[PDB]
Amino acid sequence: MLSFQYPDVYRDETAIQDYHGHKVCDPYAWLEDPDSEQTKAFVEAQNKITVPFLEQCPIRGLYKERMTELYDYPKYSCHFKKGKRYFYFYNTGLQNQRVLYVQDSLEGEARVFLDPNILSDDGTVALRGYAFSEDGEYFAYGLSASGSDWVTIKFMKVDGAKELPDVLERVKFSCMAWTHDGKGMFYNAYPQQDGKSDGTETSTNLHQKLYYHVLGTDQSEDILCVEFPDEPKWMGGAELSDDGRYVLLSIREGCDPVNRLWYCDLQQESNGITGILKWVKLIDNFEGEYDYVTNEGTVFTFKTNRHSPNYRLINIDFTDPEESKWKVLVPEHEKDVLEWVACVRSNFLVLCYLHDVKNTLQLHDLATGALLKIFPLEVGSVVGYSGQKKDTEIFYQFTSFLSPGIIYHCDLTKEELEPRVFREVTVKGIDASDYQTVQIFYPSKDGTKIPMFIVHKKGIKLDGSHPAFLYGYGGFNISITPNYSVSRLIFVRHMGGVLAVANIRGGGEYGETWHKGGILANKQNCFDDFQCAAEYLIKEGYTSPKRLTINGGSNGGLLVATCANQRPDLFGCVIAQVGVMDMLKFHKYTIGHAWTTDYGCSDSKQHFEWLIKYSPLHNVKLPEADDIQYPSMLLLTADHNDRVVPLHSLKFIATLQYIVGRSRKQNNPLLIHVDTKAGHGAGKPTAKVIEEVSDMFAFIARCLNIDWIP
């Protein structure tokens, strides 16, 4: 099937760097520049081979047709109230971007409030963050072009959906919080830098500052509220307490779930928002996370992981702040992770737990912390919720592997709390009853039991004949919970596949201990867990090595690329989306410096020793055995991505093609598809989503020669 000669790619053999005595050659270092003629030519040559390969077999057309039909279903978000009006996002089915609607009453006629589709024909302009003023009469929203992390904040007066003149530039990784006096809004922005700032650049992002914009003025007049000149990596986000009296400043450095917490009592300020607010440094260290829930006077309720890896709720009284005085409102659960908490109807708390990778939802009393009501849920995830302190009702959205989901509503003013189905859509073309989801726990190399969900057609014989698609992430305290994916269901129904999701360490499924078990010196545990998931599927008869595909994106891209290098014999196909491949240089680009909390940094000798062992780019090696070659591989990235710079995938594919692609025994393709006007993933328009999944599954079908099941 090999009808491709890989492109000529210059090797700069002089690119040698000493890492604590260890010489490392980076012959494709020049691919770090996305604007050079050399890099542009590289991309062009790679796509010249990948595109015809992907578009050759008719199965892609069949898949695309099926995806376009099945993905075409109404997609609603929960309703949420702001002031006297209700809002909700809704995509009729195939619009590139979902639209924000507004209605003056729960039973009132809805109208378009903000339609991002008219901002760009290809849907490359997407909403990225928003914030309503406390009274709900004004609205701020961020817009990102082509998936870039850079944002432009614009404003509207809600009544009449009137566009305002206010425009904020240089916004990135920003908070958006209006002061309750309705005068203005807090946000973050970066100092003007040379070069481009459109998502194509790779410049490191440092010195983020907190500004305050007074509505009706030019951005040049904004107040520089907080800056940390001596700590270039710190990021300070602001939020207002529910009563509008306190500005709470959460300071983060890196990606660990920890933050400093400072507060400014506005009642004690005499000159409004300035650059010299009288901050009280309540929590002035990075030892734990303090997520504001609500306050009653000086008694503040926080969700925290302080001495509680599964999280708990504590009350800190600003008038008696010493730790020994804090009160535990809802103790840490022995196993269940408290994911998030919201305060609603003044004195109720909605707590969302993760129990064995499945969400639970319940209501507690704010004053006593007592359990008041359990909201019954089937196996799945809570992916949406609405209900602030002043609200008297909640909406929540549930989803699962086999169903698009349901939006529930509960009027909290009733003595008897009866949650009712508010919105339920069914995908015509998929019969959920034909499939089943099972959860198993498999032992990893060190004996740790790891959860894995497996979705497949009911009644199949576990004879190892089925193609399988195994997904994982493993990092950053992120829990990979059940989600509805039409694309994956098409693989099951029309390609006869088995879906599997492994909840490997590094994630947050079992709290901070689960996260810590897959980071820094322990990162290899992630890879071992994932390799063991594959071995389980094979041993139990769900699939066989030659029929097994693994997939991951970003930190998940790192996962699958590492697994390809470490156990090429275990996989038939590997699809890595926007992966972090150069573990020695990741921290030098854009926001990569923030990831050192999970990976470590090569500037440290101890960390380099961990990194060099698994860095994908530095572990490409011909398999020793003559009967073993690398699996078919497909790397996906845009030529410009500011979250995970493209150079990771570009250098990795150049290395794979040179070291492995040239070997006589390598017959499986090693390809990269480089896209345009797309970024990390957020805000990706529908048209692009359909194209991407069609490419992915077409590639799997061709490499494994899978016949389409109509």
XYZ file of C-alpha atoms in Angstrom, residues 95-707:
613
model
C -24.427 25.765 12.237
C -20.678 26.386 12.524
C -21.078 28.027 15.938
C -23.831 27.775 18.502
C -25.975 30.876 18.982
C -26.865 32.681 22.204
C -30.612 33.302 22.619
C -32.578 35.452 25.033
C -36.169 35.399 26.292
C -37.883 37.712 28.777
C -39.712 34.853 30.464
C -39.418 31.076 30.794
C -42.481 30.782 28.529
C -41.650 33.861 26.460
C -40.645 33.908 22.793
C -36.883 33.551 22.347
C -34.818 35.720 20.016
C -31.232 35.758 18.802
C -29.006 37.663 21.205
C -25.532 36.899 19.821
C -24.951 34.927 16.615
C -21.227 34.270 16.007
C -21.935 32.821 12.561
C -22.415 36.224 11.018
C -18.906 37.203 12.164
C -17.222 34.799 9.724
C -18.484 32.546 6.954
C -16.218 29.639 7.890
C -16.967 29.962 11.599
C -13.385 30.768 12.566
C -14.544 33.528 14.910
C -15.806 32.024 18.133
C -16.990 33.127 21.529
C -14.352 32.655 24.232
C -15.648 33.675 27.641
C -18.359 36.096 28.659
C -19.707 37.905 31.695
C -22.932 39.695 32.448
C -23.030 42.651 34.806
C -24.572 41.845 38.201
C -27.936 43.352 37.213
C -27.869 41.474 33.881
C -28.244 44.668 31.855
C -24.765 44.712 30.302
C -22.774 41.951 28.627
C -19.076 41.425 27.853
C -17.890 38.663 25.548
C -14.586 37.487 24.203
C -13.941 36.615 20.570
C -11.105 34.420 19.326
C -10.057 34.202 15.691
C -8.936 30.898 14.170
C -8.702 29.126 17.509
C -6.069 31.473 18.930
C -5.882 32.017 22.702
C -5.698 35.781 22.092
C -9.082 37.382 22.721
C -10.820 40.657 21.898
C -13.488 41.635 24.432
C -16.562 43.467 23.163
C -19.674 44.764 24.929
C -23.437 45.014 24.529
C -26.346 46.570 26.397
C -28.754 43.636 26.861
C -31.998 45.548 26.321
C -32.196 45.839 22.537
C -28.955 43.846 22.101
C -27.125 47.106 21.395
C -23.448 46.975 20.471
C -21.322 49.324 22.545
C -18.052 51.001 21.420
C -15.849 49.375 24.082
C -13.179 47.035 22.730
C -10.399 45.391 24.749
C -7.315 43.995 23.003
C -4.332 41.869 24.156
C -6.633 39.768 26.342
C -5.541 36.178 27.052
C -6.244 33.554 29.771
C -8.502 36.207 31.214
C -10.984 36.551 34.009
C -14.085 38.692 33.311
C -15.736 40.128 36.406
C -17.978 43.174 36.728
C -18.006 45.188 39.930
C -21.524 45.314 41.390
C -21.749 49.085 41.029
C -21.998 48.368 37.267
C -19.176 50.787 36.515
C -16.712 48.458 34.875
C -15.101 45.094 34.587
C -11.888 43.290 35.573
C -9.939 41.390 32.887
C -6.355 40.270 32.140
C -4.088 41.401 29.333
C -0.479 40.990 28.265
C 2.089 43.741 27.537
C 2.411 44.666 23.848
C 4.931 42.344 22.181
C 6.845 42.476 18.889
C 5.991 40.116 16.051
C 2.499 38.707 15.568
C -0.197 37.998 18.141
C -2.744 36.016 16.135
C -1.987 32.466 17.228
C 0.745 31.830 14.671
C 3.568 33.034 16.936
C 5.445 30.943 19.522
C 6.512 33.750 21.896
C 6.348 32.867 25.609
C 3.536 34.598 27.534
C 4.774 36.365 30.695
C 3.796 39.321 32.924
C 0.032 38.935 32.611
C -1.618 41.872 34.358
C -5.046 42.539 35.868
C -6.814 45.586 34.474
C -10.110 47.299 35.179
C -12.124 48.761 32.312
C -14.623 51.528 33.030
C -17.548 51.108 30.622
C -17.751 54.015 28.182
C -14.026 54.761 28.055
C -11.086 53.797 25.849
C -8.902 50.857 26.839
C -5.978 53.258 27.095
C -7.662 54.643 30.241
C -7.941 51.269 31.977
C -6.624 50.911 35.485
C -3.643 48.611 35.945
C -4.847 46.963 39.136
C -2.444 44.139 39.832
C 0.929 43.172 38.358
C 3.746 40.915 39.585
C 6.978 42.242 38.009
C 9.152 39.989 40.182
C 7.093 36.865 39.369
C 6.674 36.794 35.572
C 4.717 33.515 35.591
C 2.059 34.484 38.143
C -1.496 35.031 36.871
C -4.033 36.888 39.007
C -7.736 36.498 38.290
C -10.433 38.530 40.008
C -14.010 37.730 40.968
C -16.517 39.581 43.135
C -18.127 38.036 46.180
C -21.881 37.396 45.798
C -22.733 40.487 47.856
C -20.386 42.611 45.723
C -18.356 43.739 48.746
C -15.106 41.860 48.155
C -12.779 41.477 45.232
C -11.196 38.015 45.503
C -7.869 37.634 43.737
C -6.776 34.088 42.905
C -3.101 33.886 41.990
C -1.856 30.883 40.047
C 1.510 29.783 38.747
C 1.498 26.723 36.559
C -1.285 24.182 36.255
C -1.549 22.569 39.679
C -4.860 22.933 41.535
C -3.451 25.468 44.036
C -3.699 29.237 44.346
C -2.922 32.170 46.584
C -6.027 34.064 47.665
C -6.009 37.761 48.453
C -9.045 39.909 49.051
C -9.953 43.571 48.904
C -12.836 44.736 51.101
C -14.381 47.448 48.919
C -16.245 48.885 51.920
C -12.775 49.876 53.174
C -11.729 51.582 49.913
C -12.308 55.310 49.351
C -11.103 55.837 45.770
C -12.758 53.027 43.828
C -10.712 50.599 41.782
C -7.066 51.679 41.579
C -3.616 50.157 41.311
C -3.063 50.415 45.080
C -6.011 48.499 46.541
C -5.527 47.408 50.157
C -5.150 43.671 49.569
C -5.324 41.348 52.574
C -3.157 38.340 51.736
C -5.400 35.717 53.329
C -3.677 32.725 51.719
C -0.218 33.808 50.626
C 1.309 30.555 49.366
C 0.684 27.868 46.723
C 0.008 24.999 49.165
C -3.661 24.476 48.316
C -6.648 25.423 46.225
C -9.335 27.803 47.516
C -12.306 28.080 45.156
C -14.919 30.612 46.277
C -18.435 29.254 46.713
C -20.261 32.001 48.595
C -20.050 34.151 51.738
C -22.379 35.334 54.471
C -20.846 38.472 55.863
C -17.217 37.722 56.756
C -17.756 33.929 56.673
C -16.463 32.628 53.338
C -17.183 29.127 52.029
C -14.443 27.622 49.850
C -14.008 24.307 48.048
C -10.438 23.260 48.929
C -7.987 20.396 48.606
C -6.004 21.569 51.658
C -5.284 18.280 53.473
C -8.101 16.838 51.394
C -7.088 15.263 48.074
C -10.738 14.375 47.267
C -11.740 17.977 48.111
C -14.027 19.384 50.815
C -15.876 22.545 51.835
C -14.521 24.843 54.529
C -15.582 28.148 56.070
C -12.946 30.793 56.716
C -14.040 33.795 58.757
C -12.085 36.853 57.629
C -12.317 38.194 61.209
C -10.616 35.068 62.641
C -8.520 33.744 59.711
C -5.951 31.417 61.355
C -6.179 27.888 59.943
C -6.916 26.276 63.322
C -10.122 28.322 63.376
C -11.462 27.273 59.972
C -14.673 25.235 60.105
C -15.321 22.149 57.962
C -18.747 22.505 56.354
C -18.761 19.331 54.230
C -15.962 16.874 55.044
C -13.873 15.162 52.410
C -15.414 11.922 51.151
C -13.280 8.774 51.522
C -13.443 8.015 47.793
C -15.661 10.441 45.873
C -14.114 13.560 44.439
C -16.064 16.782 45.032
C -15.846 18.240 41.503
C -17.640 21.539 41.954
C -20.094 23.335 44.205
C -22.583 26.132 43.531
C -24.697 28.222 45.925
C -28.323 28.755 44.913
C -31.557 30.128 46.412
C -29.568 31.921 49.086
C -28.961 28.996 51.426
C -28.638 25.856 49.300
C -25.474 24.303 47.927
C -25.410 22.023 44.878
C -22.528 19.548 45.163
C -21.337 17.507 42.192
C -19.252 14.415 42.980
C -17.384 11.956 40.813
C -17.993 8.393 42.051
C -15.960 5.858 40.055
C -15.869 8.196 37.058
C -19.640 8.842 37.139
C -21.253 12.067 38.352
C -23.687 12.387 41.226
C -25.560 15.590 42.146
C -27.037 16.612 45.465
C -28.364 19.523 47.458
C -27.049 20.576 50.873
C -27.940 23.245 53.420
C -25.455 26.123 53.467
C -25.674 26.755 57.212
C -25.317 23.215 58.474
C -23.819 21.410 55.490
C -26.490 18.704 55.844
C -27.585 16.600 52.868
C -31.087 17.670 51.795
C -31.742 15.937 48.488
C -30.145 13.488 46.075
C -30.921 14.200 42.419
C -31.092 10.760 40.708
C -28.866 10.362 37.648
C -28.125 7.473 35.301
C -24.480 6.577 34.553
C -22.851 9.546 32.874
C -21.671 13.109 33.374
C -23.117 16.441 34.406
C -21.802 18.755 31.664
C -23.844 21.881 32.345
C -25.448 23.696 35.264
C -27.105 26.983 36.129
C -28.272 28.527 39.372
C -26.567 31.406 41.211
C -27.176 32.587 44.775
C -30.043 34.913 43.853
C -31.754 32.305 41.639
C -34.584 30.089 42.875
C -34.201 27.232 40.413
C -31.513 25.095 38.851
C -30.951 23.602 35.429
C -28.438 20.816 34.811
C -27.401 18.849 31.744
C -26.591 15.156 31.817
C -24.895 13.250 29.011
C -23.588 9.713 28.511
C -21.835 7.543 25.927
C -25.120 6.413 24.364
C -27.458 9.389 24.703
C -27.253 13.074 23.590
C -28.388 13.980 27.057
C -31.144 15.642 28.970
C -31.514 19.050 30.565
C -33.332 18.877 33.899
C -35.002 21.718 35.767
C -35.808 21.993 39.472
C -37.878 24.771 41.055
C -36.243 25.217 44.471
C -39.133 27.194 45.994
C -41.230 24.022 46.333
C -41.322 22.091 49.614
C -40.997 18.923 47.567
C -38.054 19.191 45.179
C -39.123 17.469 41.983
C -36.562 17.623 39.125
C -38.307 17.511 35.752
C -37.068 16.869 32.218
C -36.860 20.293 30.596
C -35.267 19.351 27.286
C -34.524 15.983 25.695
C -33.394 15.303 22.136
C -32.972 11.877 20.531
C -30.577 11.140 17.662
C -32.493 9.475 14.835
C -30.087 6.903 13.435
C -28.656 5.429 16.641
C -30.528 2.964 18.841
C -28.951 3.139 22.312
C -30.506 -0.189 23.305
C -28.291 -1.989 20.766
C -25.159 -1.109 22.730
C -23.853 -1.303 26.257
C -21.309 0.461 28.411
C -19.331 -1.549 30.936
C -16.816 -0.357 33.506
C -13.940 -2.607 34.506
C -10.859 -2.081 36.649
C -7.591 -3.509 35.394
C -4.267 -3.790 37.248
C -1.383 -1.700 35.938
C 2.293 -2.703 36.122
C 2.550 -1.783 39.811
C -0.778 -3.365 40.749
C -2.828 -0.169 40.836
C -6.397 -0.811 39.659
C -7.285 1.537 36.808
C -10.885 2.198 35.623
C -11.836 1.760 31.984
C -15.168 2.205 30.247
C -15.828 -0.043 27.239
C -18.707 0.595 24.834
C -19.728 -2.030 22.275
C -22.638 -3.722 20.500
C -24.550 -6.095 22.776
C -23.861 -9.798 22.334
C -20.509 -9.629 20.545
C -18.123 -12.582 20.896
C -14.892 -11.668 22.671
C -12.759 -13.469 20.085
C -10.300 -10.621 19.449
C -11.672 -9.934 15.975
C -13.034 -6.437 16.560
C -11.280 -3.185 15.727
C -10.971 -1.060 18.869
C -10.468 2.645 19.582
C -8.790 3.310 22.928
C -8.678 6.883 24.218
C -6.766 8.408 27.110
C -5.385 11.738 28.355
C -3.729 11.253 31.758
C -2.697 14.550 33.279
C -3.459 17.935 34.728
C -6.004 16.640 37.238
C -8.507 16.287 34.346
C -11.115 13.538 34.713
C -12.159 11.799 31.499
C -15.854 11.175 32.085
C -18.680 9.779 29.893
C -19.569 11.959 26.909
C -21.787 11.647 23.862
C -19.900 11.243 20.615
C -21.712 10.534 17.360
C -18.342 10.079 15.637
C -17.333 7.266 17.993
C -20.765 5.651 17.702
C -20.372 5.570 13.918
C -17.122 3.648 14.458
C -19.075 1.164 16.603
C -22.104 0.793 14.329
C -20.635 1.263 10.858
C -17.127 -0.066 11.382
C -18.012 -2.738 13.933
C -15.683 -1.261 16.510
C -15.279 -1.320 20.270
C -14.735 1.965 22.140
C -12.604 2.167 25.278
C -11.608 5.032 27.577
C -8.898 4.395 30.213
C -8.876 6.575 33.342
C -5.126 6.492 33.766
C -3.157 8.247 36.472
C -2.298 11.903 36.007
C -6.029 12.556 35.784
C -8.279 13.700 38.592
C -10.592 10.702 38.767
C -9.473 9.712 42.251
C -8.460 13.113 43.512
C -5.099 14.745 43.895
C -3.408 11.426 44.668
C -4.474 10.160 41.239
C -3.030 13.314 39.678
C 0.248 13.071 41.599
C 0.554 9.412 40.621
C 0.995 10.479 36.992
C 3.221 13.543 37.004
C 6.854 14.571 37.419
C 8.995 11.562 38.447
C 5.812 9.443 38.117
C 4.826 10.397 34.559
C 5.869 6.947 33.298
C 2.948 5.540 35.339
C 0.594 7.174 32.800
C 2.176 5.327 29.930
C 2.321 2.039 31.838
C -1.371 2.406 32.774
C -2.300 3.046 29.139
C -0.210 0.172 27.777
C -1.870 -2.088 30.364
C -5.311 -0.913 29.149
C -4.372 -2.073 25.662
C -3.092 -5.386 27.026
C -6.400 -5.860 28.855
C -8.481 -5.315 25.724
C -6.286 -7.805 23.874
C -6.159 -10.440 26.629
C -9.923 -10.267 27.223
C -10.727 -10.685 23.535
C -12.114 -7.266 22.660
C -9.485 -6.746 19.980
C -6.004 -7.699 18.753
C -2.849 -5.568 18.321
C -3.275 -5.198 14.553
C -6.887 -4.026 14.996
C -6.196 -1.610 17.864
C -6.130 2.154 17.412
C -5.118 4.563 20.193
C -5.953 8.259 20.254
C -5.233 11.248 22.441
C -4.994 15.016 22.079
C -2.415 17.477 23.518
C -1.098 15.860 26.738
C -3.056 12.930 25.244
C -0.996 13.326 22.052
C 2.129 12.933 24.194
C 0.500 9.814 25.655
C -0.076 8.021 22.389
C 3.200 9.092 20.783
C 5.113 7.738 23.794
C 3.126 4.510 23.670
C 4.007 4.119 19.968
C 7.745 4.407 20.808
C 7.565 2.169 23.880
C 5.273 -0.585 22.627
C 4.986 -0.395 18.844
C 3.944 -4.078 18.860
C 0.762 -3.361 20.808
C -0.950 -1.028 18.346
C -2.068 -1.058 14.759
C -2.851 2.635 14.466
C -2.034 5.799 16.447
C -3.775 9.159 15.989
C -2.226 12.041 17.926
C -3.906 15.429 17.878
C -1.837 18.554 18.660
C 0.549 16.591 20.832
C 3.352 17.795 23.060
C 6.282 15.873 21.548
C 9.443 17.781 22.453
C 9.584 17.392 26.221
C 12.971 19.096 26.392
C 11.810 22.390 24.824
C 8.038 22.597 25.484
C 8.482 25.237 28.191
C 10.122 27.714 25.813
C 7.005 28.369 23.726
C 3.841 30.375 24.391
C 2.117 29.081 27.559
C 4.237 25.907 27.782
C 5.992 27.262 30.879
C 2.776 26.578 32.798
C 2.987 22.819 32.172
C 6.149 22.303 34.201
C 3.970 21.499 37.223
C 2.964 18.247 35.498
C 6.140 17.519 33.509
C 9.053 19.169 35.236
C 11.492 21.281 33.205
C 14.671 20.199 31.377
C 16.566 23.159 32.892
C 16.770 21.009 36.028
C 19.109 17.995 35.909
C 16.759 15.861 37.992
C 13.833 16.697 35.713
C 15.860 16.200 32.525
C 16.574 12.654 33.684
C 12.835 11.924 33.849
C 12.014 13.694 30.592
C 14.686 12.227 28.375
C 13.367 8.719 29.017
C 9.945 9.310 27.488
C 10.113 12.482 25.350
C 8.575 11.291 22.051
C 10.939 13.308 19.903
C 13.943 11.752 21.649
C 12.860 8.126 21.719
C 12.103 7.268 18.102
C 13.936 3.986 17.548
C 13.669 1.134 15.070
C 12.119 -1.873 16.791
C 14.834 -4.519 17.418
C 12.772 -7.531 16.216
C 12.570 -7.960 12.436
C 8.846 -8.765 12.640
C 8.025 -5.518 14.456
C 7.539 -2.132 12.764
C 5.918 1.090 13.965
C 2.115 1.286 13.865
C 0.433 3.451 11.236
C 0.536 6.990 12.604
C -1.426 10.140 11.868
C -0.503 13.434 13.522
C -3.012 16.280 13.342
C -2.311 19.979 13.920
C -2.876 23.368 12.352
C 0.155 25.174 10.897
C -0.498 27.744 13.621
C -1.611 26.732 17.147
C -0.692 28.921 20.109
C -1.604 26.501 22.892
C 0.615 23.623 21.680
C 2.884 25.048 19.003
C 2.950 22.987 15.746
C 6.709 22.475 15.912
C 6.064 19.557 18.275
C 4.258 17.529 15.609
C 6.432 18.852 12.742
C 9.719 17.808 14.360
C 8.248 14.505 15.521
C 6.991 13.506 12.036
C 10.314 14.525 10.425
C 12.088 12.287 12.942
C 9.681 9.359 12.475
C 10.024 9.527 8.687
C 13.808 9.688 8.836
C 14.560 7.065 11.491
C 11.644 4.687 10.908
C 10.097 5.642 7.571
C 13.294 4.818 5.666
C 13.597 1.267 7.017
C 12.705 -1.504 4.566
C 10.398 -3.231 7.069
C 8.350 -0.098 7.694
C 5.266 -0.421 5.504
C 2.727 1.335 7.742
C 2.342 5.070 6.905
C 3.729 7.789 9.194
C 1.828 10.925 8.236
C 0.892 14.396 9.349
C -2.052 16.482 8.214
C -1.524 20.199 8.776
C -4.757 22.285 8.848
C -5.449 26.041 8.541
C -7.441 28.637 10.528
C -7.813 26.212 13.429
C -6.196 26.084 16.853
C -6.116 23.792 19.874
C -9.770 22.784 19.545
C -11.927 25.283 21.416
C -14.428 27.014 19.164
C -13.708 24.687 16.225
C -16.535 25.173 13.703
C -18.850 22.264 12.920
C -17.683 21.963 9.308
C -14.098 21.422 10.475
C -15.168 18.919 13.150
C -16.906 16.753 10.553
C -13.855 16.887 8.277
C -11.471 15.930 11.076
C -13.387 12.877 12.330
C -13.937 11.767 8.730
C -10.170 11.914 8.150
C -9.420 10.054 11.383
C -11.780 7.159 10.805
C -10.978 6.970 7.091
C -7.301 6.606 8.047
C -8.115 3.820 10.530
C -10.293 2.024 7.952
C -7.602 2.185 5.262
C -4.704 1.137 7.500
C -6.596 -1.754 9.058
C -8.613 -2.442 5.847
C -11.992 -2.299 7.600
C -15.106 -2.734 5.457
